[PDB]
Design an enzyme around this catalytic site. Sequence first.
Site, mmCIF file in Angstrom:
data_model
loop_
_atom_site.group_PDB
_atom_site.id
_atom_site.type_symbol
_atom_site.label_atom_id
_atom_site.label_comp_id
_atom_site.label_asym_id
_atom_site.label_seq_id
_atom_site.Cartn_x
_atom_site.Cartn_y
_atom_site.Cartn_z
ATOM 1 N N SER A 43 0.844 -1.191 0.000
ATOM 2 C CA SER A 43 0.000 0.000 0.000
ATOM 3 C C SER A 43 0.883 1.247 0.000
ATOM 4 O O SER A 43 0.903 2.035 0.946
ATOM 5 C CB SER A 43 -0.971 -0.021 1.183
ATOM 6 O OG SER A 43 -0.281 -0.283 2.392
ATOM 7 N N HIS A 59 -3.114 -6.174 2.833
ATOM 8 C CA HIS A 59 -2.184 -7.147 3.404
ATOM 9 C C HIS A 59 -2.767 -8.543 3.587
ATOM 10 O O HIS A 59 -2.037 -9.488 3.905
ATOM 11 C CB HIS A 59 -1.627 -6.650 4.739
ATOM 12 C CG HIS A 59 -0.848 -5.375 4.636
ATOM 13 N ND1 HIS A 59 -0.481 -4.641 5.744
ATOM 14 C CD2 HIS A 59 -0.377 -4.697 3.562
ATOM 15 C CE1 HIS A 59 0.199 -3.576 5.357
ATOM 16 N NE2 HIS A 59 0.270 -3.583 4.038
ATOM 17 N N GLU A 73 -4.705 -2.443 9.253
ATOM 18 C CA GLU A 73 -3.974 -2.947 10.412
ATOM 19 C C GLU A 73 -4.716 -2.706 11.713
ATOM 20 O O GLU A 73 -5.238 -1.613 11.953
ATOM 21 C CB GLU A 73 -2.583 -2.312 10.509
ATOM 22 C CG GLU A 73 -1.722 -2.494 9.272
ATOM 23 C CD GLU A 73 -0.446 -1.673 9.291
ATOM 24 O OE1 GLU A 73 0.021 -1.263 10.380
ATOM 25 O OE2 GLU A 73 0.095 -1.427 8.201
ATOM 26 N N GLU A 126 1.774 -9.435 7.116
ATOM 27 C CA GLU A 126 2.511 -8.966 8.295
ATOM 28 C C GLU A 126 2.332 -9.838 9.540
ATOM 29 O O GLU A 126 2.716 -9.437 10.645
ATOM 30 C CB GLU A 126 2.172 -7.508 8.599
ATOM 31 C CG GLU A 126 2.607 -6.560 7.499
ATOM 32 C CD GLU A 126 2.385 -5.104 7.841
ATOM 33 O OE1 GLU A 126 1.819 -4.805 8.918
ATOM 34 O OE2 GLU A 126 2.791 -4.246 7.025
ATOM 35 N N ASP A 171 -4.125 1.128 11.604
ATOM 36 C CA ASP A 171 -3.750 1.742 10.324
ATOM 37 C C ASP A 171 -4.886 1.523 9.340
ATOM 38 O O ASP A 171 -5.089 0.418 8.811
ATOM 39 C CB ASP A 171 -2.429 1.199 9.771
ATOM 40 C CG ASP A 171 -2.019 1.847 8.442
ATOM 41 O OD1 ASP A 171 -2.723 2.740 7.921
ATOM 42 O OD2 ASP A 171 -0.950 1.465 7.917
ATOM 43 N N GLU A 181 -3.690 5.660 12.279
ATOM 44 C CA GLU A 181 -2.818 5.992 11.160
ATOM 45 C C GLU A 181 -3.587 6.066 9.841
ATOM 46 O O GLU A 181 -4.437 5.209 9.546
ATOM 47 C CB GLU A 181 -1.705 4.946 11.061
ATOM 48 C CG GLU A 181 -0.695 5.187 9.946
ATOM 49 C CD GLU A 181 0.192 3.980 9.715
ATOM 50 O OE1 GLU A 181 0.392 3.185 10.652
ATOM 51 O OE2 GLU A 181 0.690 3.824 8.588
ATOM 52 N N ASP A 228 1.122 8.594 7.398
ATOM 53 C CA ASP A 228 1.952 7.660 6.647
ATOM 54 C C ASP A 228 2.008 8.074 5.178
ATOM 55 O O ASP A 228 2.967 8.717 4.760
ATOM 56 C CB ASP A 228 1.462 6.220 6.818
ATOM 57 C CG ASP A 228 2.179 5.239 5.902
ATOM 58 O OD1 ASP A 228 3.208 5.596 5.268
ATOM 59 O OD2 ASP A 228 1.707 4.094 5.811
ATOM 60 N N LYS A 259 9.429 5.626 7.359
ATOM 61 C CA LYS A 259 9.821 4.498 6.507
ATOM 62 C C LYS A 259 10.959 4.958 5.614
ATOM 63 O O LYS A 259 10.745 5.769 4.707
ATOM 64 C CB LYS A 259 8.651 4.055 5.638
ATOM 65 C CG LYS A 259 7.457 3.494 6.381
ATOM 66 C CD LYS A 259 6.342 3.307 5.386
ATOM 67 C CE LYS A 259 5.285 2.408 5.885
ATOM 68 N NZ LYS A 259 4.082 2.622 5.059
ATOM 69 N N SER A 282 8.748 2.417 11.168
ATOM 70 C CA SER A 282 7.947 1.343 10.589
ATOM 71 C C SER A 282 8.652 0.436 9.591
ATOM 72 O O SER A 282 9.476 0.879 8.782
ATOM 73 C CB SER A 282 6.699 1.935 9.928
ATOM 74 O OG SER A 282 5.911 0.939 9.311
ATOM 75 N N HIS A 283 8.284 -0.840 9.642
ATOM 76 C CA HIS A 283 8.579 -1.787 8.567
ATOM 77 C C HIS A 283 7.758 -1.487 7.298
ATOM 78 O O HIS A 283 6.895 -0.591 7.290
ATOM 79 C CB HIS A 283 8.258 -3.202 9.062
ATOM 80 C CG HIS A 283 6.801 -3.429 9.351
ATOM 81 N ND1 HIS A 283 6.244 -4.688 9.398
ATOM 82 C CD2 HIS A 283 5.791 -2.564 9.607
ATOM 83 C CE1 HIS A 283 4.954 -4.588 9.665
ATOM 84 N NE2 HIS A 283 4.652 -3.309 9.797
ATOM 85 N N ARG A 284 8.040 -2.235 6.231
ATOM 86 C CA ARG A 284 7.133 -2.347 5.096
ATOM 87 C C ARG A 284 6.465 -3.715 5.141
ATOM 88 O O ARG A 284 6.944 -4.626 5.828
ATOM 89 C CB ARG A 284 7.868 -2.195 3.757
ATOM 90 C CG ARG A 284 8.628 -0.888 3.551
ATOM 91 C CD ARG A 284 7.797 0.361 3.842
ATOM 92 N NE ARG A 284 6.538 0.497 3.107
ATOM 93 C CZ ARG A 284 6.335 1.366 2.111
ATOM 94 N NH1 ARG A 284 7.326 2.133 1.687
ATOM 95 N NH2 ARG A 284 5.148 1.466 1.526
ATOM 96 N N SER A 285 5.369 -3.876 4.405
ATOM 97 C CA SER A 285 4.686 -5.175 4.364
ATOM 98 C C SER A 285 5.527 -6.234 3.645
ATOM 99 O O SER A 285 5.412 -7.423 3.938
ATOM 100 C CB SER A 285 3.307 -5.050 3.718
ATOM 101 O OG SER A 285 3.433 -4.589 2.386
ATOM 102 N N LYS A 302 6.438 0.039 14.756
ATOM 103 C CA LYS A 302 5.555 -1.007 14.270
ATOM 104 C C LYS A 302 6.351 -1.862 13.298
ATOM 105 O O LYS A 302 6.886 -1.370 12.300
ATOM 106 C CB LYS A 302 4.242 -0.444 13.686
ATOM 107 C CG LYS A 302 4.289 0.145 12.291
ATOM 108 C CD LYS A 302 2.870 0.428 11.810
ATOM 109 C CE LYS A 302 2.811 0.506 10.305
ATOM 110 N NZ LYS A 302 1.457 0.902 9.835
HETATM 111 O O1 2PG Z 1 0.922 0.828 5.313
HETATM 112 C C1 2PG Z 1 1.884 0.642 6.095
HETATM 113 O O2 2PG Z 1 2.053 1.304 7.145
HETATM 114 C C2 2PG Z 1 2.912 -0.373 5.705
HETATM 115 C C3 2PG Z 1 3.504 -1.100 6.910
HETATM 116 O O3 2PG Z 1 2.509 -1.907 7.547
HETATM 117 O O4 2PG Z 1 2.367 -1.244 4.705
HETATM 118 P P1 2PG Z 1 3.009 -1.135 3.236
HETATM 119 O O5 2PG Z 1 4.473 -1.401 3.444
HETATM 120 O O6 2PG Z 1 2.284 -2.164 2.410
HETATM 121 O O7 2PG Z 1 2.756 0.286 2.806
HETATM 122 MG MG MG Z 2 1.062 1.384 3.089
HETATM 123 MG MG MG Z 3 0.351 2.813 6.888
#
Ligand code: 2PG
Ligand code: MG
Ligand code: MG
Lengths: 436, 437
Positions: A39, A159, A168, A211, A246, A294, A319, A344, A371-374, A395
């Site tokens: 996303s 996800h 989330e 995730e 989220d 979020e 985000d 990120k 934050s991580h990524r998915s 997260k």
């Molecule tokens: O949306 C988000 O915050 C991220 C992390 O969970 O997801 P994605 O990396 O798919 O953007």
């Molecule tokens: Mg995202």
């Molecule tokens: Mg997000």
Amino acid sequence: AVSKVYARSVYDSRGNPTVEVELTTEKGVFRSIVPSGASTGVHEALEMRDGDKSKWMGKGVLHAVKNVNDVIAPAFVKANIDVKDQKAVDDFLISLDGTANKSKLGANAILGVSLAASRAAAAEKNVPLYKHLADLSKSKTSPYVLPVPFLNVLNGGSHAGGALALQEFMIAPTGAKTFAEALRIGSEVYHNLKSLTKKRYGASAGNVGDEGGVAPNIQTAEEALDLIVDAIKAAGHDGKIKIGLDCASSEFFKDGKYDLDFKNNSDKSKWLTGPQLADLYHSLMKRYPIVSIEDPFAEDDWEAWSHFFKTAGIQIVADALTVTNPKRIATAIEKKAADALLLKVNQIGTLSESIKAAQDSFAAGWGVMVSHRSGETEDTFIADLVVGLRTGQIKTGAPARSERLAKLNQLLRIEEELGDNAVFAGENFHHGDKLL
Amino acid sequence: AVSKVYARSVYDSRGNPTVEVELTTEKGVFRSIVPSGASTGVHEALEMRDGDKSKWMGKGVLHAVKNVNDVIAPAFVKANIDVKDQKAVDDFLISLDGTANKSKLGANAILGVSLAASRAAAAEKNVPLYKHLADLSKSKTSPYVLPVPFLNVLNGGSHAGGALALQEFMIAPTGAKTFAEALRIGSEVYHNLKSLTKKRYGASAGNVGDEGGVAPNIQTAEEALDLIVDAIKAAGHDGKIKIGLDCASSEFFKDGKYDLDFKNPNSDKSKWLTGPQLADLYHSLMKRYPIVSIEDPFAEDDWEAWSHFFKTAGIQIVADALTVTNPKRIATAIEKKAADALLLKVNQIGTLSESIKAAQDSFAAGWGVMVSHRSGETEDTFIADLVVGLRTGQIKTGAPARSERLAKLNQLLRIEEELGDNAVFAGENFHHGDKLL
Ligand SMILES: O=C(O)[C@@H](CO)OP(=O)(O)O
Ligand SMILES: [Mg+2]
Ligand SMILES: [Mg+2]
Ligand SMILES: O=C(O)[C@@H](CO)OP(=O)(O)O
Ligand SMILES: [Mg+2]
Ligand SMILES: [Mg+2]
Ligand SMILES: [Mg+2]
Ligand SMILES: [Mg+2]
Ligand SMILES: [Mg+2]
Ligand SMILES: [Mg+2]
Ligand SMILES: [Mg+2]
Ligand SMILES: [Mg+2]
């Protein structure tokens, strides 16, 4: 000195290729792996993919890898840059690409070099990475702050397969006294959630999303939140566990409105206005221990953010709105759209720009949630980063799937190493950087 | 010399605690993490758990961690064993425990020290881990052999919620020229599988089990195998992709019979299958699908059923719960002609040396060896180096999803790159990878 820069293709946690960089110095070989989102914000720096439908179904990163090996590497080595000077490393990389959004070389070519240089620098300095990152960001180090983990235990939206629109549903063990306790009680809630989900929605519902959260085929936020509250009481941790969301609402924003059934022949009559969606969130905030939300509104729906924020009274995290980009953060601050940045590194492309993003946020009185990524990897960088930046909140997934546990495990190790020179952020997660 | 041995609790890929060991020498700090099974054999070495219901659901490892820090560590540091001498390291650890099944200290206390020592030895010798493991096992090194990965793309049994009895459905890209190609085309089949699964069985069926495979709510092997064949077709890799099964039949063996609906508590006892009936099912599948390997077709002590099936199977038959990486039980399996491949899981036996012996005994009998993950894995990449070191030509370490699986597959990409012209991909010769060239 840096003697070698080398990139290869490796696989991320969903089976897609991504870029791995190795930087060689007199101290050894230092590796960084670039994560990948699903996303993604439309304003994120360029993730360069090959688009060759006959390989990795168009998701190859051979071009990005080639950009590192054939463009970045020879120039970078020739430049004889001091890896300790992160700003010089990143200025060089930024200049070599020459574009705002890193569209020439790719953010996924640049980022790995940026991160690997910081690892090389930490080694040269004989300090753990988190201490080096604290140096680079000029953070307070007496004491260091361990973050509250926001554990994404129920996955929806992009996800996970299913009807659930919100992306989330996180638990935050703010009531623990140590990170280790927070992780233990979080894992206990998670396992109770797994059993309860199978009970209520069938054995298939207990299987996991990208995730690591359970992915039940549910249609509303209320039933998801009821599951989590049920899991918290089953585990016996009521009052010690809070909830984060989220919404990833950009994923369902169309024609000025919000489609909570976008995981559908969706009814255009049912689509919600900004005000109506705000009423929905307020109704949830009243019935559940929600302490953070979020992307409650879309990535450029500025008016909706500002209006909600006026009376939200909890942490509102940007985000897709901000994409870890100081320019967009500046706008969000001025419009009073949110009060926390989701950080990120791959949304912006260098460590230096990410550090600047965090510093601008802190300066405005914002929180920062690393934050991580998915699409994650075995890389643990963000664990050292959240400590280095002293944010008090991260997260990095459910306590399931080791691309998530790798980070959580690293934070256990960091806590152990720091001992008496660290404190767990707990209820003060929002202003973790100001703590003490 | 080894100056420190330290253990801590960390989390495995399922969110359960496990033991992590760090061993310190002049060359640095060397880490090993112990994996954890779900469908464990009854004959496995003791995985010590705390059983305190008020912490980690009773699954704490504080006792095993304490056995490392308070028992193994001071004794091991004092002993000052040459880490290059894996046999001496392991003899020392086995002797400290003093029990057959490692019940004094726990296999999950012992194994971490065993593995971390080998990491430290590799560093001392200035060689990659896989070269050192080849030294320890006395394997041929001209050339090294990269394994066919058996990728578990559809999860059932104990590894995923659903009605599917059989535990693992794997794809094996034996038709590829390099490991990198094998992993690429394998990933492509996986992605096509995920999309097709969602189309055929609904969005939720695309969510994953413990080992990263899709977990559709299906009842029969035939429709699981139809999904896989359809996915191979969609990706355009027909002829290059073969299939492996892990039946984990001990999970559904009761009263001399096999219940292919065991997760259903309302399972009809009249539908329960006998040994010969089950053999018939397998043969029916082997004729309709490109199956090249079947693991645990019969229960862990149903010896006669194994020997009977093996006489006419004509494909690789893998012993897992039957043998539990135990040289003693392997010797029995060899004698009874029960199987022709060992599933090698280090934590089933508890030391690297015992695992190497198990592999050597298997190879000496003309068996294959498939190095294996546990369903509770970690970010540790040991088995990637182990499969290359042992020259087996085959590994199972999960679907190309979840990084506790990709960490190993990625490490194999790195090993292949490093070895260049000094390595060959096992491909169609995966069964006798050790004898290759
Ligand atoms: O949306 C988000 O915050 C991220 C992390 O969970 O997801 P994605 O990396 O798919 O953007
Ligand atoms: Mg995202
Ligand atoms: Mg997000
Ligand atoms: O049965 C098996 O072969 C293993 C690995 O897939 O599973 P577990 O670790 O649960 O025993
Ligand atoms: Mg400092
Ligand atoms: Mg209102
Ligand atoms: Mg910039
Ligand atoms: Mg098993
Ligand atoms: Mg050798
Ligand atoms: Mg028959
Ligand atoms: Mg098995
Ligand atoms: Mg023995």
